[PDB]
């Protein structure tokens, strides 16, 4: 299954959901890359909540 | 089972929208009326080898 992400959708996720941007700030530039981060989030329960 | 994501940087959306429209015209051509149904075959030459 494939989901298509646009940059505007990423910005809407950041503005509408500060928890995702909060994880993005201390997760992406430090440990793992952005597509890995988004796949982890999409496989996580926080996305479901 | 598996999760695959696709991230666009707001610069490649034209590619898959072009893919969508060429798929649409491809299925339109595949569901199109054939040329001998929409046109009269009387005046043209007879069928052969």
């Amino acid at each position: 299954v494939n989901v298509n992400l646009s940059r505007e959708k990423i910005l809407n996720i950041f503005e509408n959901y500060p928890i995702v941007k909060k994880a993005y700030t201390d997760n992406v530039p430090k440990n793992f890359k952005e597509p890995e981060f988004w796949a982890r989030f999409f496989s996580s329960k926080l996305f479901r909540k | 089972a598996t999760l695959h994501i696709n991230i666009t940087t707001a610069s490649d959306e034209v590619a898959q929208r072009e893919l969508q429209e060429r798929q649409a015209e491809e299925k339109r051509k595949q569901n199109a009326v054939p040329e001998w149904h929409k046109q009269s075959t009387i005046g043209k030459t007879a069928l052969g080898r």
Partner: peptide, 24 residues
């Protein structure tokens, strides 16, 4: 079954990351 689910998920993520790095 459990370990294959975990490894297929993490290597699918790693392959998506590698594809994204190769495209950029």
């Amino acid at each position: 079954d459990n370990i294959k689910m975990t490894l297929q998920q993490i290597i699918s993520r790693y392959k998506d990351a590698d594809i994204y790095e190769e495209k950029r």
